[PDB]
Write a protein that binds this ligand. Structure first.
Ligand SMILES: Nc1ncnc2c1ncn2[C@@H]1O[C@H](COP(=O)(O)OP(=O)(O)OP(=O)(O)O)[C@@H](O)[C@H]1O
Ligand SMILES: Nc1ncnc2c1ncn2[C@@H]1O[C@H](COP(=O)(O)OP(=O)(O)OP(=O)(O)O)[C@@H](O)[C@H]1O
Ligand SMILES: Nc1ncnc2c1ncn2[C@@H]1O[C@H](COP(=O)(O)OP(=O)(O)OP(=O)(O)O)[C@@H](O)[C@H]1O
Ligand SMILES: Nc1ncnc2c1ncn2[C@@H]1O[C@H](COP(=O)(O)OP(=O)(O)OP(=O)(O)O)[C@@H](O)[C@H]1O
Ligand SMILES: [Mg+2]
Ligand SMILES: [Mg+2]
Ligand SMILES: [Mg+2]
Ligand SMILES: [Mg+2]
Lengths: 257, 43, 13, 257, 257, 257, 13
């Protein structure tokens, strides 16, 4: 049946090439050329993690015959309270090596060995605020012992962690902020989410200026609210046998907050 | 004037060079930066 | 254009 | 009967001429020509052992009318905790000589004797991490005193064992990495298994995106998982009177991983 | 191609003989002559590391035939939470010795043995605040038993660490403070960078008092900010087809901090 | 065929008169004349074995009409975990006596007799770390009872073994440190290898800046790495029909380390 | 005079 397959995509996640993502990708290209360590900051659900993943994918590992892969961009997200051993494990496993049993000293030396030769040139640490205060020293040592641009990604929660160590603060001072959208950029984004993401059976014409108040009141300009609303409404509409997102559905979803 | 207090109490070598840093390295800050709004930028 | 995390897992992976 | 004949075939093993096999063979040919010692490292079940077997079969012993055979490539897998006498016994028996009862010194001198005259150019030691640490000295002496390219094969556990002895580490510094399959290379490998390995009466259409999705999730790029899933799925399918693998049987197998 | 080579030049680091570096080098010569242990303290990116690194390259090892090298100055940066075996391993490896697995007592005796005979007379420990509280007792015994001027380098976090141990504080009271720089020598340092570091084909005229203003505001007197802004401004300007750094690019960089 | 002759040449080994070889030989001439027991210590692949082997050829056996040969230098490498009998076997076989099977005591008495009879004055024991603890007592008795300089050759592992027995430690206090190549000495070594070892039809100019940077990074100053890299790179270049080592072939080899 | 970080290693070596 048709409806269950639409639900199976609408409960999924997708990537939309917003201009915010483009702007980050030009910036990360400049940092990767300069090997410039830096940070990406901005409120929750602003699209940072999805923009970072899109950068990983477009700069995927290149295979070379019988060599370790060339992996220009390594993306990791630490587990909470990430120590040095946890950091080294995530980096080495990302490069498709297996960690052996060993000391932190073994893990460090093995990680530095494979950060070389795999030709890593950027390290993106998402949820960089999950790093333990002692493991930033190893992150800093990677940044300056190798020609690697380390990009710390977090919310303003990260800046509190950063400013608690002036050696971290002074290495990651350069920054880019993901902001909330508004106005015509929000209108174009809302238009994109109808006509590119949902691709629903019958249009709702989400350029409409009045219902844009309903979105704004729930969405506050968070993309990660906007993308949530429409999938909730569309699944309900297609569950209810409505070929469009009706106002009665959008406002009911937007009322759950 | 305020910088000279934090300058000397830290045992810093006294100079215009170091004093200037203790200027640049809050209630009165908000108040003074309100008073910064001035007609010399507006007339 | 839009992409799926599951496609990207195969395509770039 | 048809069924038991097909089951007896699928139960077995075969060698598929994957590109990573050819890559290793050309590299081993270079190392053998130069008599340079080296190591082969890669994750478990990535195909290292089969590729090393395929090499020594392409370079099997040559008879010369009542001389001992010219045997340019020797392949051994040591048993666990292989001591020096075990190692010498492994090598001697490969060259078609019987080990006479004697001391370790007699075994060493006899092995050194028959590595000459058989004209051994390359010695491949698979599961080289099973060697006792004292046994590496005798492996180094074979590389040093005879002009023989010794190739250590193992997983990342070998790379840790080797780094515990600078004299071994510094001799086997050159390496090849065996990788997992992914992307287009994995899609071609699935196509080859359907055509060249399983050889069912009817096309299983394993190139299809729905089939690749199942296979990619369960195989994770390990050629060992790919082989042992598809053979078992074919055996299950034939046992049910199906003339091909189907999604239901394939999912039923893949669910066990 | 022109650009990629110059970009790779700007992407790497350089050293410039600033008066702070010259001042430290004379001070370290006095301490090394006197065998006086001391600390070098100052804010991040004031140039302490580059200055201490330049000191060891100016006092390079002397080799004489068949002896261990005469190495007057040893420079180490400990890993985070450096214990005594980590410290001993750092010193012995700098002196071109391989450590053999053994007890702390064995690592200690071997380090004391080679700190003699290599003729070490100064040990610079960069970011000494990474040392565990227990390993400071071995640092003090190196300073006290041998005739070695130990130099602790760090931020004010080092002063926090050593004030917690009376016996460490009193041995390392003699100190030199690295400063941020502003005005005349800053103006000279900006000019020195465009003369000796950027080497762009056309003059950027960063000597211009308005260019010095924006650099004063962003670099805030830290040489590690000044270097990173100009290098990043060069790569952007060259990549945008500009022969020159100018405010339209320089202030785009400067606003990024 | 010319190519097969050139590969056969580059495949092998040759002795190059490096300055560290002359240093060792002059030092061994002193110790042999003073009849003084000593050790040669240096990290792996620094060239200790080739240098000691060159010394026994410089001081080959000498003959008198109707007399046994005087053999001033005996060179042995023990097998791993060498007991007394295997030491005595090694020595007596080098002096060209097939000692009939017998007791350790019979082997000892015969070894003393031939060490006296052949006029041996220096006994170089390469990889002396391979001796069992019980065997150093027999090595010490050869040094003490006969007028023989015993030279223990090994890595820093030998220094650790020797420290475990005061009676060996105090007999072998004198040492020569065999060191790695660096600086201009490395550059002179690279040029000697091009002119004297590789001897290719066209000059490769390996001493030039980019080539020297590749070799410096890949060899890290080990003469073992320098020899093995350049020989394989020469074999690869000639196999491709090149008349020289090319930069691409050199980096291709260097990338495997 | 310029003092390139690589030339300091070349001089130090
Ligand atoms: N560019 C985008 N295309 C498609 N969906 C998006 C995009 N950006 C955000 N999303 C949606 O909104 C959610 C929030 O995005 P993301 O996880 O990247 O934000 P974030 O700022 O990294 O969040 P946090 O700081 O909370 O971890 C995503 O899970 C996804 O559902
Ligand atoms: N070239 C190949 N052709 C066909 N099947 C293969 C090939 N290589 C591997 N296989 C399949 O994968 C299995 C595992 O491969 P193999 O034994 O070579 O692994 P390995 O890398 O040596 O593993 P380990 O390190 O765990 O011992 C084989 O037994 C076979 O089923
Ligand atoms: N004398 C110098 N010449 C050239 N560049 C310099 C000099 N001093 C500093 N730099 C630049 O500034 C950066 C920071 O300098 P340095 O690493 O010496 O700082 P630091 O004081 O040791 O910092 P931290 O305390 O954060 O570890 C250098 O990596 C280099 O880019
Ligand atoms: N004088 C030399 N002339 C030419 N090649 C040399 C020379 N010395 C060393 N080599 C090269 O370096 C290799 C390693 O040298 P060597 O066998 O002497 O090492 P070693 O120091 O005894 O090492 P280990 O301690 O690991 O046994 C040689 O096999 C040869 O390829
Ligand atoms: Mg996130
Ligand atoms: Mg195997
Ligand atoms: Mg520093
Ligand atoms: Mg040796």
């Amino acid at each position: 049946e048709w409806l269950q397959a639409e639900i199976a995509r609408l409960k999924g996640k997708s990537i939309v090439p917003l201009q915010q993502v483009k702007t980050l990708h030009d910036w990360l290209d400049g940092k990767r050329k300069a090997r410039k360590s830096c940070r990406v900051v901005g409120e929750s659900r602003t699209g940072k993690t999805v923009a970072c993943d899109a950068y990983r994918y477009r700069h995927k590992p290149q295979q070379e015959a019988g060599r370790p892969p060339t992996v220009p961009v390594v993306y990791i997200r630490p587990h909470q309270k990430c120590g040095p051993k946890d950091l080294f494990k995530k980096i080495t496993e990302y490069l498709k090596y297996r960690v052996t049993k060993g000391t932190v000293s073994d893990f460090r030396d093995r990680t530095i060995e494979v950060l070389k030769g795999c030709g890593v040139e950027m390290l993106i640490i998402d949820e960089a605020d999950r790093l333990k205060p002692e493991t930033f020293a190893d992150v800093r040592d990677i940044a300056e012992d190798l020609g690697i641009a380390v990009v710390l990604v977090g919310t303003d929660r990260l800046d509190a962690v950063i400013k608690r160590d002036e050696q971290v603060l002074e290495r990651f001072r350069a920054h880019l902020r993901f902001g909330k959208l508004s106005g015509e950029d929000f209108k174009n984004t809302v238009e994109m989410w109808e006509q590119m993401v949902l691709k629903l059976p019958v249009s709702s014409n989400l350029k409409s200026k009045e219902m844009l108040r309903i979105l704004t009141s729930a969405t506050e300009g968070y993309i990660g609210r906007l993308d949530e609303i429409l999938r909730e409404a569309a699944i309900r509409s297609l569950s209810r046998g409505l070929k469009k997102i009706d106002k009665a559905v959008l406002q009911e979803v937007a009322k759950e907050y | 004037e305020a910088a000279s207090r934090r300058l000397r109490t830290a045992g810093k070598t006294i100079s215009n060079q170091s004093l200037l840093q203790e200027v640049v390295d809050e209630r009165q800050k908000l108040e003074q930066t309100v008073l910064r709004s001035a007609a010399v930028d507006e007339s | 254009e839009v992409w799926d995390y599951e496609q990207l897992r195969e395509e770039y992976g």
